[PDB]
Design an enzyme around this catalytic site. Structure first.
Site, PDB file in Angstrom:
ATOM      1  N   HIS A 150       0.725  -1.146  -0.008  1.00 55.25           N
ATOM      2  CA  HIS A 150      -0.007  -0.039  -0.300  1.00 55.25           C
ATOM      3  C   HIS A 150       0.866   1.327  -0.003  1.00 55.25           C
ATOM      4  O   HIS A 150       0.305   2.370  -0.249  1.00 55.25           O
ATOM      5  CB  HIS A 150      -0.803   0.089   1.155  1.00 55.25           C
ATOM      6  CG  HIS A 150      -2.131  -0.766   1.312  1.00 55.25           C
ATOM      7  ND1 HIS A 150      -3.171  -0.671   1.966  1.00 55.25           N
ATOM      8  CD2 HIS A 150      -2.289  -1.925   0.456  1.00 55.25           C
ATOM      9  CE1 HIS A 150      -4.122  -1.856   1.674  1.00 55.25           C
ATOM     10  NE2 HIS A 150      -3.649  -2.473   0.829  1.00 55.25           N
ATOM     11  N   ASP A 151       2.236   1.159   0.507  1.00 50.39           N
ATOM     12  CA  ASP A 151       2.958   2.184   0.315  1.00 50.39           C
ATOM     13  C   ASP A 151       3.776   2.382  -1.001  1.00 50.39           C
ATOM     14  O   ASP A 151       4.605   3.151  -1.159  1.00 50.39           O
ATOM     15  CB  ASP A 151       4.102   1.976   1.464  1.00 50.39           C
ATOM     16  CG  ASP A 151       4.627   3.398   1.671  1.00 50.39           C
ATOM     17  OD1 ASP A 151       5.328   4.155   1.095  1.00 50.39           O
ATOM     18  OD2 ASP A 151       4.717   3.659   2.955  1.00 50.39           O
ATOM     19  N   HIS A 155      -1.806  -1.267  -9.585  1.00 52.06           N
ATOM     20  CA  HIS A 155      -1.925  -1.029 -11.148  1.00 52.06           C
ATOM     21  C   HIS A 155      -3.445  -0.395 -11.553  1.00 52.06           C
ATOM     22  O   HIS A 155      -4.433  -0.445 -11.019  1.00 52.06           O
ATOM     23  CB  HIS A 155      -1.983  -2.402 -11.694  1.00 52.06           C
ATOM     24  CG  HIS A 155      -0.899  -2.790 -12.113  1.00 52.06           C
ATOM     25  ND1 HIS A 155       0.278  -3.256 -11.097  1.00 52.06           N
ATOM     26  CD2 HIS A 155      -0.104  -3.009 -13.200  1.00 52.06           C
ATOM     27  CE1 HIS A 155       1.340  -3.749 -11.444  1.00 52.06           C
ATOM     28  NE2 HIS A 155       1.256  -3.488 -12.765  1.00 52.06           N
ATOM     29  N   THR A 203       2.666   6.149  -5.136  1.00 52.09           N
ATOM     30  CA  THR A 203       4.074   6.508  -5.448  1.00 52.09           C
ATOM     31  C   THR A 203       5.009   5.433  -4.948  1.00 52.09           C
ATOM     32  O   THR A 203       4.764   4.623  -4.109  1.00 52.09           O
ATOM     33  CB  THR A 203       4.364   7.833  -4.451  1.00 52.09           C
ATOM     34  OG1 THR A 203       4.342   7.315  -3.054  1.00 52.09           O
ATOM     35  CG2 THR A 203       3.185   8.886  -4.451  1.00 52.09           C
ATOM     36  N   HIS A 375      -0.278 -13.975  -0.846  1.00 52.05           N
ATOM     37  CA  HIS A 375      -1.400 -13.814   0.065  1.00 52.05           C
ATOM     38  C   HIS A 375      -1.690 -15.166   0.856  1.00 52.05           C
ATOM     39  O   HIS A 375      -2.378 -14.983   1.992  1.00 52.05           O
ATOM     40  CB  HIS A 375      -2.746 -13.620  -0.909  1.00 52.05           C
ATOM     41  CG  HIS A 375      -2.691 -12.567  -1.553  1.00 52.05           C
ATOM     42  ND1 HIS A 375      -2.390 -12.373  -3.141  1.00 52.05           N
ATOM     43  CD2 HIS A 375      -3.161 -11.254  -1.052  1.00 52.05           C
ATOM     44  CE1 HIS A 375      -2.438 -10.989  -3.149  1.00 52.05           C
ATOM     45  NE2 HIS A 375      -2.986 -10.421  -2.124  1.00 52.05           N
ATOM     46  N   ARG A 476      -0.214  -8.997 -18.094  1.00 49.56           N
ATOM     47  CA  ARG A 476       0.834  -8.041 -17.841  1.00 49.56           C
ATOM     48  C   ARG A 476       2.360  -8.740 -18.409  1.00 49.56           C
ATOM     49  O   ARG A 476       3.123  -7.827 -18.307  1.00 49.56           O
ATOM     50  CB  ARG A 476       0.957  -7.695 -16.622  1.00 49.56           C
ATOM     51  CG  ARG A 476      -0.179  -7.076 -15.816  1.00 49.56           C
ATOM     52  CD  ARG A 476      -0.003  -6.965 -14.321  1.00 49.56           C
ATOM     53  NE  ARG A 476      -1.491  -6.515 -13.838  1.00 49.56           N
ATOM     54  CZ  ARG A 476      -1.678  -6.096 -12.346  1.00 49.56           C
ATOM     55  NH1 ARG A 476      -0.788  -6.425 -11.825  1.00 49.56           N
ATOM     56  NH2 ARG A 476      -2.915  -5.757 -12.162  1.00 49.56           N
ATOM     57  N   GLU A 592       3.229  -1.316  27.990  1.00 49.18           N
ATOM     58  CA  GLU A 592       2.752  -2.378  29.069  1.00 49.18           C
ATOM     59  C   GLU A 592       2.744  -3.716  28.316  1.00 49.18           C
ATOM     60  O   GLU A 592       3.187  -4.718  28.807  1.00 49.18           O
ATOM     61  CB  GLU A 592       1.682  -1.772  29.595  1.00 49.18           C
ATOM     62  CG  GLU A 592       0.873  -1.026  29.091  1.00 49.18           C
ATOM     63  CD  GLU A 592       1.046   0.440  28.755  1.00 49.18           C
ATOM     64  OE1 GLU A 592       1.448   0.598  27.466  1.00 49.18           O
ATOM     65  OE2 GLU A 592       1.002   1.261  29.739  1.00 49.18           O
TER      66      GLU A 592
HETATM   67  C1  HEM Z   1      -6.627  -9.605   4.026  1.00 44.89           C
HETATM   68  C2  HEM Z   1      -5.595  -9.542   3.247  1.00 44.89           C
HETATM   69  C3  HEM Z   1      -5.495  -8.926   1.866  1.00 44.89           C
HETATM   70  C4  HEM Z   1      -6.654  -8.672   0.794  1.00 44.89           C
HETATM   71  C5  HEM Z   1      -7.976  -8.594   1.242  1.00 44.89           C
HETATM   72  C6  HEM Z   1      -6.041  -8.293  -0.268  1.00 44.89           C
HETATM   73  C7  HEM Z   1      -6.524  -7.997  -1.665  1.00 44.89           C
HETATM   74  C8  HEM Z   1      -6.066  -7.785  -2.606  1.00 44.89           C
HETATM   75  C9  HEM Z   1      -6.745  -7.360  -3.921  1.00 44.89           C
HETATM   76  C10 HEM Z   1      -8.294  -7.035  -3.796  1.00 44.89           C
HETATM   77  C11 HEM Z   1      -6.099  -7.156  -4.798  1.00 44.89           C
HETATM   78  C12 HEM Z   1      -6.138  -6.888  -6.306  1.00 44.89           C
HETATM   79  C13 HEM Z   1      -6.330  -7.937  -7.333  1.00 44.89           C
HETATM   80  C14 HEM Z   1      -6.484  -7.412  -8.592  1.00 44.89           C
HETATM   81  O1  HEM Z   1      -7.602  -6.559  -8.854  1.00 44.89           O
HETATM   82  O2  HEM Z   1      -5.443  -7.604  -9.447  1.00 44.89           O
HETATM   83  C15 HEM Z   1      -4.418  -7.276  -4.362  1.00 44.89           C
HETATM   84  C16 HEM Z   1      -3.447  -7.315  -4.930  1.00 44.89           C
HETATM   85  C17 HEM Z   1      -2.153  -7.403  -4.470  1.00 44.89           C
HETATM   86  N1  HEM Z   1      -1.860  -8.035  -3.006  1.00 44.89           N
HETATM   87 FE1  HEM Z   1      -3.234  -8.147  -1.732  1.00 44.89          FE
HETATM   88  N2  HEM Z   1      -4.544  -8.623  -0.294  1.00 44.89           N
HETATM   89  C18 HEM Z   1      -4.014  -9.041   1.079  1.00 44.89           C
HETATM   90  C19 HEM Z   1      -3.052  -9.236   1.644  1.00 44.89           C
HETATM   91  C20 HEM Z   1      -1.648  -9.067   0.819  1.00 44.89           C
HETATM   92  C21 HEM Z   1      -0.484  -9.375   1.575  1.00 44.89           C
HETATM   93  C22 HEM Z   1      -0.281  -9.778   2.946  1.00 44.89           C
HETATM   94  C23 HEM Z   1       0.308  -9.036   0.439  1.00 44.89           C
HETATM   95  C24 HEM Z   1       1.731  -9.231   0.749  1.00 44.89           C
HETATM   96  C25 HEM Z   1       2.725  -8.846   0.057  1.00 44.89           C
HETATM   97  C26 HEM Z   1      -0.351  -8.660  -0.739  1.00 44.89           C
HETATM   98  C27 HEM Z   1       0.001  -8.290  -1.867  1.00 44.89           C
HETATM   99  C28 HEM Z   1      -0.544  -7.961  -3.018  1.00 44.89           C
HETATM  100  C29 HEM Z   1       0.101  -7.474  -4.294  1.00 44.89           C
HETATM  101  C30 HEM Z   1       1.413  -7.577  -4.696  1.00 44.89           C
HETATM  102  C31 HEM Z   1      -1.033  -7.346  -4.986  1.00 44.89           C
HETATM  103  C32 HEM Z   1      -0.834  -6.848  -6.644  1.00 44.89           C
HETATM  104  C33 HEM Z   1      -1.002  -5.359  -6.496  1.00 44.89           C
HETATM  105  C34 HEM Z   1      -0.837  -4.905  -7.870  1.00 44.89           C
HETATM  106  O3  HEM Z   1      -1.513  -5.355  -9.160  1.00 44.89           O
HETATM  107  O4  HEM Z   1      -0.238  -3.502  -8.199  1.00 44.89           O
HETATM  108  N3  HEM Z   1      -1.756  -8.685  -0.228  1.00 44.89           N
HETATM  109  N4  HEM Z   1      -4.620  -7.724  -3.051  1.00 44.89           N
HETATM  110 CA   LIG Z   2       5.085   5.510  -1.504  1.00 44.01          CA
END
Ligand code: HEM
Ligand SMILES: [Ca+2]
Ligand SMILES: CCCCCCCCCCO[C@@H]1O[C@H](CO)[C@@H](O[C@H]2O[C@H](CO)[C@@H](O)[C@H](O)[C@H]2O)[C@H](O)[C@H]1O
Ligand SMILES: [Cl-]
Ligand SMILES: [Cl-]
Ligand SMILES: [Cl-]
Ligand SMILES: [Cl-]
Ligand code: NA
Ligand code: NA
Length: 611
Positions: A150-151, A155, A203, A375, A476, A592
């Protein structure tokens, strides 16, 4: 035959000096030795591999020349949208810029569905026996890495929709029988090299945007506009809008674990505001915000580099390597007392006199996204514990109830967290191992998930994320597993048995992919790959990390030429210098539970780990 047949072509085109480096690392790789040698040789190996990757695996996307012109001395802070970091490129690292690439794209348009994403998801990814990491890595660590994504990266989507349907062979085992989603947006580069690119709507700079926002329109919502501070609830949790969406930096597709880290770093920021105001009473709100953002974003980078990665890659060599990136091989004592000495190796990446992008404008890359698809780290259930309960049959805080983690996700999860509180959530996350990155460990609630819009609100089209992720990598044009290894100067697999010794994995893989090792999807390979002892990740993913983790520090003015007291304030810099890990941050605000229950050195280890 000295060199592997698949790397002979590139070797023969190398310069004499690159040949030497290649032969050095390849001597270890052919015998799987780099991680089985003493630290000094391991580090030499890693530095030699890094230099090669920096030369061969940084590819620009979009025209590199031009870029808006500006005076760096008029931008001694982190802008809301990430612009004006690189003196030669005002756009570099900012919101809505192209993802770079580590490798030439591989067009997969004619095999986007081969094999079927639902079949892959159902047969290879779906959680069976739950596997965790023991003591090594806890749920705070799982939350941390999402907090970082998130930091970092998201896409841009096409406004249109497409859909996929589970085939009859596995439909019965799919929580969703079909789902819709937005394709990744394609933009022309209008450039000589790579022709199509995708945009990063976050960013790319390590700027704390998960807390501060991805642009000015977002960032203003979160500020009190007094003493540089950010808004936070009296329970120490994030505030929420009337639609349920959290008031923080990037809150899209989140869960409760991330929300508490965000809340913790809001308090960190505000406490830095207090400390700096104290030394400089006449600073404006704006000045205080700017300094505290520099400090807090640096604290985050530091915690990730010398704490999180160190527990993720639990070996002597990697502790040394990551500390060398931050402090230099000369060490912390010398760095803290005498400043940066020598070059990047002796003094470290942090505090280099100048940023270095190795000839290619700073960006995060398509492949960096792919290797961070982790995930499977999220456990199925959270064991909630009592922060003031009597110690149980171990010396752990006693269990109160199991809660399904599917209930802790998104808007609903914000509601559940509002009833649990920070200390209970944090402690419980600390006392539980996260999931291992192996086959058959992808949580079922991800296969029936509500995705969110840019504004944090729910979309009515649920998704099967396991299936979608496999689709995204192909969509991609990220190379599939074996070619991915080749592009990073790694030895490809010849057969399934080179990938893993688990017979059931081999058999399951064969039934889906046949014996075509070139068809194996990246995600499947990364999860299945036999792991280095102590490594929570695959060696393949690790190679992208080698390159990009260094780059995130080395390319940034504010970790390099402007990592100084003049830019951060004296107190600001001392705050960064005296914070070594997440433990230090949690202790500052929640001393604590730390005193009572945090027994491990690192707050990322399961909190009763004996080290
Ligand atoms: C409750 C936990 C999480 C939820 C609900 C969640 C949900 C999502 C969703 C909805 C997407 C977008 C999929 C798409 O439309 O292509 C995504 C992408 C992604 N998530 Fe998560 N996520 C979770 C945890 C994590 C964790 C622990 C990581 C660890 C690195 C991670 C890394 C990513 C990455 C790299 C992408 C691709 C982002 C991109 O396309 O730029 N996520 N996630
Ligand atoms: Ca940033
Ligand atoms: C104190 C020590 C003294 C240092 C002396 C070092 C002298 C050599 C430095 C560069 O080495 C050359 O680099 C070329 C690449 O720039 C290579 O071309 C190779 O690769 C090219 C493609 O990159 C092909 O055109 C060539 O045919 C192929 O030989 C060539 O092989 C290699 O020797
Ligand atoms: Cl050190
Ligand atoms: Cl050096
Ligand atoms: Cl990293
Ligand atoms: Cl430091
Ligand atoms: Na092998
Ligand atoms: Na200790």
């Amino acid at each position: 035959g000295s060199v592997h047949p698949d790397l002979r072509d590139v070797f023969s085109k190398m310069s004499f000096f690159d040949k030497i480096g290649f032969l050095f690392i390849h001597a270890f790789d052919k015998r799987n030795l780099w991680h089985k040698v003493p630290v000094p040789i391991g580090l030499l190996y890693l530095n030699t591999r890094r230099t090669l990757l920096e030369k061969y695996n940084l590819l620009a996307v979009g025209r590199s020349s031009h870029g808006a012109l500006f005076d760096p001395k008029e931008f001694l802070y982190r802008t809301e949208d990430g612009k004006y970091n690189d003196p030669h490129n005002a756009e570099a690292g900012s919101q809505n810029t192209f993802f770079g690439r580590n490798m030439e794209p591989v067009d997969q348009q004619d095999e986007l569905m081969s094999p079927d994403p639902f079949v892959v998801a159902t047969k290879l990814l779906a959680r069976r026996e739950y596997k965790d990491t023991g003591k090594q890595f806890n749920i705070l660590a799982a939350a941390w890495i999402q907090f970082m994504v998130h930091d970092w990266m998201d896409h841009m989507e096409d406004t249109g929709q497409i859909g996929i349907t589970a085939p009859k062979e596995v439909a019965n085992e799919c929580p969703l029988k079909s789902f819709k989603f937005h394709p990744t947006k394609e933009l022309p580069t209008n450039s000589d090299g790579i022709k199509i690119g995708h945009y990063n709507i976050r960013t790319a700079w390590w700027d704390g945007s998960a807390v501060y926002g991805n642009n000015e329109e977002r960032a203003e919502k979160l500020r009190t506009y007094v003493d540089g501070k950010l808004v936070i609830g009296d329970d120490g949790l994030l505030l929420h809008k009337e639609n349920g969406v959290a008031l923080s930096g990037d809150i899209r597709n989140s869960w409760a674990g991330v929300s508490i880290l965000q809340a913790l770093f809001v308090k960190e920021h505000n406490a830095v505001c207090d400390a700096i105001k104290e030394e400089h009473p006449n600073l404006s709100d704006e000045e205080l915000y700017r300094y505290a953002k520099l400090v807090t974003s640096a604290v985050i980078a530091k915690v990730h580099t010398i704490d999180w990665t160190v527990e993720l890659l639990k070996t002597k060599t990697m502790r040394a390597a990551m500390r060398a990136n931050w402090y230099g091989l000369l060490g912390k004592k010398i760095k803290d007392t005498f400043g940066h000495i020598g070059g990047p190796i002796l003094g470290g990446l942090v505090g280099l006199k100048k940023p270095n992008n190795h000839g290619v404008p700073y960006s995060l890359t398509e492949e960096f996204t792919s290797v961070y698809r982790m995930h499977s780290l999220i456990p199925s259930t959270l064991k909630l514990r009592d922060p003031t309960g009597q110690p149980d049959a171990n010396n752990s805080p006693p269990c109160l109830e199991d809660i399904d983690i599917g209930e802790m996700i998104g808007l609903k999860g914000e509601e559940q967290l509002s009833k649990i509180g920070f200390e209970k959530q944090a402690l419980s996350m600390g006392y539980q191992a996260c999931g291992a990155l192996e086959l058959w460990n992808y949580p079922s609630f991800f296969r029936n998930l509500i995705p969110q819009n840019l504004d944090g609100t729910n979309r009515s089209d649920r998704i099967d994320l396991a299936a979608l992720e496999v689709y995204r990598d192909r969509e991609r044009s990220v190379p599939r597993y074996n070619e991915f290894r080749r592009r990073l100067f790694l030895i490809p697999i010849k057969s399934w048995e080179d990938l893993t010794s688990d017979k059931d994995a081999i058999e399951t893989i064969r039934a889906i992919y046949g014996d075509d090792v070139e068809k194996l999807d990246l995600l499947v390979g990364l999860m299945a790959e036999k792991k280095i002892k102590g490594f929570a990740i695959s060696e393949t993913a690790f190679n992208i990390f080698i390159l990009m983790a260094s780059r995130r520090l080395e390319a940034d003015r504010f970790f390099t030429s402007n990592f100084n007291e003049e830019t951060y304030t004296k107190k600001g810099m001392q705050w960064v210098k005296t914070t070594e890990g997440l433990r230090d941050v949690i202790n500052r605000h929640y001393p604590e539970i730390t005193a009572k229950w945090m027994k491990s050195s690192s707050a990322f280890s399961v909190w009763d780990a004996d080290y």
